[PDB]
Ligand binder design. Structure first.
Ligand code: CAP
Ligand code: CAP
Ligand code: MG
Ligand code: MG
Ligand code: MG
Lengths: 453, 457, 160
């Protein structure tokens, strides 16, 4: 049967649904499966499976039920575009405090509709959230401002945070791990656990934390500068996340405001992210997205995009989220991905389909990571347009020919070169650690700065 | 750089890595992106990004680190097959109790590797978990056996639990919702919240729970039989899940062993599933997988299959998990998906690539749902082979021409027919509610039982 | 939890896995942490399972936390030497519910990757059902060992 008379109204105007402030709007690229309905019928069925219906009429439906139906308001068969309007009354709210949950938004807008037999694929590209719904989300409580304050930087346009990931990914016992943190910190600001580091049997959590705290104190005393760490506290069990966070804050003591908490939020879920957001609102929430590629990749025609994810992460409370290297590194990415960063940092931004007012909600930091080194940084900043961010480089730092300290210094210098408007090879005559990144990575050097020899 | 001399050892034997007990094994269908390295180099890099390395040599690597490298032990370029062995030392364990977390397994075996630029796609199809690692997982604490006990059925081969989903998906205010529960229960056993039902402003949670409890009491009084309900307690906030679960158990009181807790585990994540598994181990954990299709669909070449998801759900502690209609309903599915059910219910089972011994870990119930009705049920059981399960049918029940109660009876009758093995259409001659399911869904009827109109009048 | 969980940890078949060879540590009381730990090591070279004698806990000459720590060290020296899994049953009995919790939590965390080798013992007749239920509901995944010291006052055939 077909349900477009009830779940489609193409005579509605997007400008009026927005000005009315009663509807979440979602934009999808969808294709029906050969053998069922035409585009409108398939789209109307989609809206029903995502709102108030199923595949047949049921005797229990009443007039109040119809009032909250999600409607298909705009379609473009030749570009595969479908747009749906969801009344805000559909979304779940906490009993304890009346706030919104991201899990409800996902369950409706991108849940069972992803397994419909009469649809070949559908992927969400953009969404709009009006004021009355927007205000019920947590938003971030800690920002890069709080990291700038701890480093001694100005709290407005404090600049580039030079960082690394401890490599190898797994395998370092507590003291070697701690020794490699010391070395980087002699030249850099910030260090994160690689996403799987935690409580492996060859590197127990408590011994590793304790050896890193010792290394932070020794690095601060030697250099006279503040240092930062991002610990992974990801777990299935909510009380294991708490236990880990509490041990860290207590162990670091007077360096407790130098600590960020990392959460693998795509594989652990919103629940893990909200555990850390609500239990530790004063510690920088670092959101790591490992596994996201299964859906976000342009090779995928299902799910949602990295843009959508990032937009959601901000509403959830992430202090920073990995946004990718925008084609500049080792992972899949595009230069057009610069728009992702601007949606998460500004108070008004444009998406592929929707303009979004954030109403003063705190910004989320773009965390640039993924096969970056000193040589690839200039090109990257040129495309994005600023350096008010954290950038982590593991192989780029520990793979430097002269070690982790020098690797750290080459990343600083590379941003000073860009900031100044200087030519890389020429700049590399006054700055040795940067010059040696050319011999560290001669394959990259030959590509970007050909005749450097 | 070529890393195949470190992360590849094709001279290892699957049979010995299994016997040896020290490795998790994963099987993937992988294709390298053009103009990079070959199959083995791509595969070796994959293993490095999924264990100890990165795309570049680092001066901090030591011989201890190598001992724990994940290795590529089997490749078949023609079939796109890649197999990797992960030392169990690599996986994270809780400080509080020394147990395993599924989140660690995922982060390594299907994480950063899903965004690698030199790989076009990779999807996990099967995994093996040895004893030393399998025994560190929660497993389910509550099974169908506990729902059979409550209904009064035998606790071994207790049979088919007749169920529904409350429809409209959303829109019913507390009393009309409660009235629709009452009606179904006059003919059926079990009712679930549709996956988004919770605390919407037009249907507050506490008023809905209270009206449902009253309707359970009045249904049990009128019919003399035990009734069940599965409440959605999904939330971002751990303490909101607890608050919801505690209010339900306390409200239902002497009917609180009739209550299951439903969790949208795919979109909310493992952490939400574990919250419910650890806080309420004596209430049946109902795992709902809304959103899974983004990766599990055969149209996807990335992520992992429904098979893998289901296998994971059991290790996490799901009492039951939606396994799909296996091609007989409205969602994407296949007949070959019967193997999924057999992996989650038995103590030893075969996957597409590995054999798994569960070592006595509790089974997970297959929950069959998705555009089912009385007419589609016979075909479905014939393919699966048994009816020791829960099946929910929303439109199938409430869209029956004579109502929710008659809709419920038609689902019962359809399993009774398959059980004794009658001709469906002849069975319908002497079974009213089942016969009227033909007129309720005449499109389906004409397709499955072609000449039915003649016999049935 | 059942014996089948203890068979799984030892490597035995989970159905008819057989006879678990065990001891109590004697002296009933009097062993200081290391000597107590040394006696655990020695038995484990030939046996599977060890329990606290029913009054062992936090006596002033053998503090609880030093004893647990020394037993953990002896478990992994025993597993290293023999190549086989070992088990221990710790008494966590107390009047105060939160003292039971505090003791159980310290043990699981100390033993770490050997935490599934731990059973919790409760003197359920003298402390009562409430103590048994505390341990049943707080730690459902750890083997609940019920000790009945004092039961004879009523169960005896001398008693009518
Ligand atoms: O795990 C890694 O390999 C990284 O630490 C980079 O290390 P290297 O510097 O040695 O490459 C990051 O987690 C990935 O970039 C994550 O990807 P994304 O940012 O796209 O989520
Ligand atoms: O919302 C729905 O559509 C359902 O309640 C079915 O309703 P109907 O029975 O009325 O069609 C189920 O959530 C899906 O079937 C889940 O699918 P899966 O088992 O594939 O996860
Ligand atoms: Mg990483
Ligand atoms: Mg549903
Ligand atoms: Mg004794």
């Amino acid at each position: 049967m077909d349900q477009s008379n009830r779940y489609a109204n193409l005579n509605l105007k997007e400008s009026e649904l927005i000005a009315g402030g009663r509807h979440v709007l979602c934009a999808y690229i969808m294709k029906p499966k050969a053998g069922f309905g035409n585009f409108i019928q398939t789209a109307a069925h989609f809206a029903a499976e995502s709102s108030t219906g199923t595949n047949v009429e049921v005797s229990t439906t009443d007039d109040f039920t119809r009032g909250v139906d999600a409607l298909v308001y705009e379609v473009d068969e030749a570009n595969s575009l479908m747009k749906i309007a969801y009344p805000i009354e559909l979304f779940d709210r906490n009993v304890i405090d009346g706030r919104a949950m991201i899990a409800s938004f996902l369950t409706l807008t991108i849940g069972n509709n992803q397994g419909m037999g009469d649809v070949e694929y559908a992927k969400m590209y953009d969404f709009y959230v009006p004021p009355a719904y927007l205000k019920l989300f947590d938003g971030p409580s800690t920002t890069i401002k709080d990291l700038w304050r701890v480093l001694g930087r100005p709290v407005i346009n404090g600049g580039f945070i030079v960082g690394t990931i401890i490599k190898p990914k797994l395998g370092l016992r507590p003291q070697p791990f701690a020794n490699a943190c010391y070395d980087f910190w002699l030249g850099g600001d910030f260090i994160k656990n690689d996403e799987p580091q935690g409580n492996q049997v060859f590197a127990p959590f408590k011994d590793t934390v304790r050896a890193v705290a010792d290394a932070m104190r020794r690095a601060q005393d030697k250099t006279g500068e503040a240092k930062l760490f991002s610990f992974n506290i990801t777990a299935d069990d909510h009380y294991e996340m708490l236990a880990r966070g509490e041990f860290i804050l207590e162990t670091f003591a007077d360096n407790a405001d130098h600590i960020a908490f990392l959460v693998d939020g795509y594989v652990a879920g919103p629940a893990a992210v909200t555990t850390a957001r609500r239990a530790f609102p004063k510690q920088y929430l670092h959101y790591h997205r490992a596994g996201h590629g299964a859906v976000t990749s342009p090779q995928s025609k299902r799910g949602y995009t990295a843009f959508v994810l990032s937009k959601m992460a901000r509403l959830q409370g992430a202090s920073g989220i990995h946004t990718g290297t925008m084609g500049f590194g080792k992972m899949e990415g595009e230069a057009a991905d610069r728009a992702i960063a601007y949606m998460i940092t500004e108070d008004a931004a444009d998406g592929p389909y929707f303009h979004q007012e954030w109403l003063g909600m705190n910004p989320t930091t773009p965390i640039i990571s993924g096969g970056m080194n000193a040589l690839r940084m200039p090109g990257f900043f040129d495309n994005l347009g600023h350096s008010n961010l954290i950038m982590t480089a593991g192989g780029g730092a520990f793979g430097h020919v002269d070690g982790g300290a020098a690797g750290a210094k080459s990343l600083r210098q590379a941003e000073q070169c860009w900031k100044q408007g200087a030519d890389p090879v020429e700049f590399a005559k006054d700055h040795r650690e940067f010059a040696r990144a050319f011999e560290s990575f001669p394959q990259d050097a030959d590509k970007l700065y050909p005749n450097w020899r």
